[PDB]
Amino acid sequence: PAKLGYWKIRGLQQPVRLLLEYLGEKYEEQIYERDDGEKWFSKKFELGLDLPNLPYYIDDKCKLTQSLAILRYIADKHGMIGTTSEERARVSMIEGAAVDLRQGISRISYQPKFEQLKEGYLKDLPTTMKMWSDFLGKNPYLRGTSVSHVDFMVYEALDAIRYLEPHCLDHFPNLQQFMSRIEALPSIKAYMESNRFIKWPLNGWHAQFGGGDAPP
Amino acid sequence: PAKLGYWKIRGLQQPVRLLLEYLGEKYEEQIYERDDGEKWFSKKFELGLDLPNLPYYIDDKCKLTQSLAILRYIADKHGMIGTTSEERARVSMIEGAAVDLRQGISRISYQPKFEQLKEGYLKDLPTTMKMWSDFLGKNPYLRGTSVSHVDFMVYEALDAIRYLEPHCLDHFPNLQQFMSRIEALPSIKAYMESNRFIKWPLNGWHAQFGGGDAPP
Ligand SMILES: N[C@@H](CCC(=O)N[C@@H](CS)C(=O)NCC(=O)O)C(=O)O
Ligand SMILES: N[C@@H](CCC(=O)N[C@@H](CS)C(=O)NCC(=O)O)C(=O)O
Fold it and tell me: Where, by residue number, does the polypeptide cross the bilayer (chains A, B)?
């Protein structure tokens, strides 16, 4: 079983957990609690990682850092990366846009001026959602009929944003169905009902938004 | 010839230009000047791009956005992405860390409080440089004896940081040699001596740092 290391939050690791649960990969999570900073910063350079960071992934074949590299390793091993250069590039494009979507809310949430930034962010949100709604179109998933790691990235990003603006998906029925479709996948549904599931926080505990001890 | 679109700055597009020049790919750059905002937003949704953004890449086979997706497409076509899942993941890990390196300086540079943030950033820089110095080790390039897209990513990131802190590489001779090695590559040296080379600005024109009309 691979060892995964990360804070006890959703943040960057959630899409990886979801993917691991979807393809039935056995893994052990090394959870770092709110007060484990010292614990991490003391072993950070003792784990044998080339470029130390959280999250990290370790198994008999690989030692990795970088949330996207970790997600793509599991996806690669399961044939979800793309078979041609054009396809692999299109996949990377979707990942990049998904990173932008999640990082956008992350940026303003860790900002002391969150309250101020929030208004501008909410003003632009609609255009962003439309772009994604138009991209998904009539497809069940981002790349067609089959689920892949990008779906779990976008799903998590949308779920986090709906915590800030609950009606953000109201005018986009396909995005709403997309969310339900993911939550209805047998392996996902079961994981979300387990005690392994981390529902909160969305961001780091110290965030102006999404960092409480409980949902707002 | 592929068409590349981006602002007339280094920013996110520089590593792509460098790579295109290294493998001899013919391309046409659609440059957006400091006052071309309107020029971009007016047709941004008219270009047929799935997820509109700058930079964008267009050729007879592909239409892409996302700087990393674009860089990886060219790299993929040239066999620099990796042959196994473990190798491709390791490559992605390096890319992610390189993105972190460049985005770190980018973050504080577009921040109005740049002047304040600068001190904290400079305090941590040494640790970051050491991490990269240790990673490169005795290798001529990040992945061994052969240059790849990641080298141009890290090179550009280090060059940008040396503009903020000129002695940041002083205690890391291998990183210094790495920089020289890249600049000594025949295709790179020639490109940097051409009139196609964009030397400044590093960040967007309106950045607190690296956004002037000329170097500081
Ligand atoms: N680009 C990196 C970002 C990693 C990162 O910022 N990790 C944060 C939490 S989300 C951290 O606590 N890192 C620990 C450290 O820097 O030592 C990734 O995608 O993994
Ligand atoms: N994650 C994206 C970021 C793209 C981005 O932020 N582009 C900026 C300039 S660096 C821009 O002007 N985009 C135009 C737009 O959003 O319409 C990437 O790596 O390409």
Answer: none
